């Protein structure tokens, strides 16, 4: 094995033993470096009832280097690109090996209801979030419904 692979097995064991509310994930069948994950939208937010699928991509440099994470489900959120790529500060400059898959996934769930206003990846979503909360929620509701497909 390798340190990344042993760490990933530890991350999985910890996540499966004590999963945070509305989050789960596991390595793919055939490749511990690629995981499938699910995040349920947080209760009381525009994303409630959404069941969102994600892919997490690691390397042999984990946990020195953060993974990348993308939504496979359709998304509408200021910090998610059109291709599903998720922008999260802890996956960039605020990375620490103290974070693991569990805490990455919980951060992404929390991100859903707490957009980062700094240079958002989806300008349309950012502008609606800022200036037309009412309409932001309709656009979010459409991708909540699609997430059940
Ligand atoms: Cl962030």
- The technique by which this structure was obtained is X-ray
- Say which residue the tokens 């994470």 belong to: 69
Distance 114 CA to ligand 1 centre (A): 8
**Under 8 Å between Cβ of 97 and 63:** yes
To the nearest 10 degrees (0 to 180), the angle between helices 133-146 and 123-131 is 130
Of 36, 22, 12, the closest CA to residue 109 belongs to: 22
Q: Which domains does the chain have, with CATH numbers?
A: 1-149 (3.10.110.10)
Provide CB contacts within 8 A for 58, sequence distance 6+.
Answer: 4, 8, 32, 33, 34, 35, 67
The three-class DSSP label of residue 35 is: strand
**Under 8 Å between Cβ of 97 and 106:** no
Distance 67 CA to ligand 1 centre (A): 15
Establish whether 87 is a catalytic residue. Answer: yes
């Amino acid at each position: 094995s390798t340190p990344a692979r042993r760490r990933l097995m530890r991350d999985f064991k910890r996540l499966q033993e004590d999963p945070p509310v509305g989050v789960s994930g596991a390595p793919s069948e055939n490749n511990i470096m690629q995981w499938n994950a699910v995040i349920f939208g947080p209760e009381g937010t525009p994303f409630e009832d959404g069941t969102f699928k994600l892919v997490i991509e690691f390397s042999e440099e984990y946990p020195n280097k953060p993974p990348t994470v993308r939504f496979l489900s359709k998304m509408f959120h200021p910090n998610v690109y059109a291709d599903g790529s998720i922008c999260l500060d802890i996956l960039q400059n605020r990375w620490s090996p103290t974070y693991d898959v569990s805490s990455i996934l919980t951060s992404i769930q929390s991100l859903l209801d707490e957009p980062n206003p700094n240079s958002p990846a989806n300008s349309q979503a950012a502008q609606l979030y800022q200036e037309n909360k009412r309409e932001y929620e309709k656009r979010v509701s459409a991708i909540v419904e699609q997430s059940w497909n």
